[PDB]
């Protein structure tokens, strides 16, 4: 899964830098995902990755990532053979820095 250009325009200003800390998903079933995240200081570029974490269900309740780019993008990967999990929704924890 891949979504780029998360400007949070519906919450705060786009150009404003936003410190990303956590994603709090609500999954179902058993599995082991491989989360990836990144960003870019612009809006046109497909941001470069910054980290990657595995969210094994039944043990972890979230994924910890550290970014402050204003335009975030997150990817989800599931390469496991014995996984039948699912993703209903997320809840990103973030702050607001500055601009320029």
């Amino acid at each position: 899964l891949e979504r780029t250009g998360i400007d949070f325009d519906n919450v705060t200003n786009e150009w404003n830098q936003k410190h990303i800390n956590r994603f709090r998903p609500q999954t179902t079933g058993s599995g082991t995902y491989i989360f990836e995240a990144g960003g870019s200081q612009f809006s046109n570029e497909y941001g470069h990755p910054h980290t990657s974490k595995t969210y094994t269900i039944g043990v972890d309740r979230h994924v910890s990532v550290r970014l402050n780019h204003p335009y975030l993008f997150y990817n989800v990967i599931d390469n496991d053979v014995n996984s039948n999990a699912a993703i209903n929704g997320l809840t990103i924890e973030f702050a607001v820095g500055g601009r320029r």
């Binding site: 410190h19 956590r22 980290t51 974490k53 043990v59 972890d60 910890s64 990532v65 550290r66």
Partner: protein
């Protein structure tokens, strides 16, 4: 994520309890936990004064040039090992005045990184490359008691009295800098308040420990001994 045993005895388990008590744990975070602990211990020892970090040692006066050891932070009682005698600290001007104008009392000062003494003291100590040889400390051997800067953790097996006496102090003072590294203020304030409370408790314990065996009443001391 990580596990830990009931007693936080060593650095290895403290650096994991830190990541435990703060779910903000990951590669980019755990790698700097040592730096947060370094900052916390620096903020602690900068003003913490208690026995367990003290250190007594003999000095070499050499009538003047006597130098301050590297671990010098604050000087406790200073005396000799022969019949007992306590020095009192004065300013450079007082000693410069004593030099010209002129031996029961003995004073001293702090000239940069030296400890000056008005009388030509001749304290003796074994040289540097001496092998063992306690030397049976000779006379005129002054013994200094001060507060020494403790060592910094460098191995997971490395422990310290602070871990065995009060680990929550370090844990809170380092979660402070952790929640600062990431963006978080409520945790910063709470951890800072708790660490300050623990430190206040410890210093108050140290205070109630000193001169705590009987009351005091100055017996109108008017130097009964004047003849000499």
């Amino acid at each position: 994520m990580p596990d830990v045993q009931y007693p936080i005895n060593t650095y290895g388990w403290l650096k994991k309890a830190v990541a435990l008590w703060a779910d903000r744990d990951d590669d980019e975070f755990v790698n700097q936990i040592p730096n947060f602990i370094n900052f916390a211990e620096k903020e602690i020892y900068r003003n913490l004064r208690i026995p367990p970090l003290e250190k007594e040692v003999y000095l070499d006066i050499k009538d003047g040039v006597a130098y301050i050891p590297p671990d010098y932070l604050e000087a406790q009682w200073m005396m000799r090992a022969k019949d007992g005698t306590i020095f009192q600290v004065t300013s450079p001007e007082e000693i410069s005045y004593r030099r010209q104008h002129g031996n029961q009392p003995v004073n001293f000062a702090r000239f940069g990184s030296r400890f000056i003494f008005y009388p030509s003291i001749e304290a003796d100590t074994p040289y540097y490359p001496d092998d063992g040889s306690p030397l049976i400390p000779a006379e005129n051997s002054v013994i200094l008691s001060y507060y020494a800067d403790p060592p910094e953790f460098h191995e997971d097996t490395d422990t310290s009295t602070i871990l065995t006496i009060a680990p929550e102090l370090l844990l809170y003072f380092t979660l402070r800098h952790a929640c600062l590294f990431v963006q978080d203020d409520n945790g910063v304030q709470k951890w800072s308040a708790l660490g300050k409370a623990i430190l206040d408790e410890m210093v108050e314990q140290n205070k109630k420990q000193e001169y705590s065996g009987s009351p005091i009443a100055i017996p109108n001391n008017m130097t009964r001994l004047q003849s000499s």
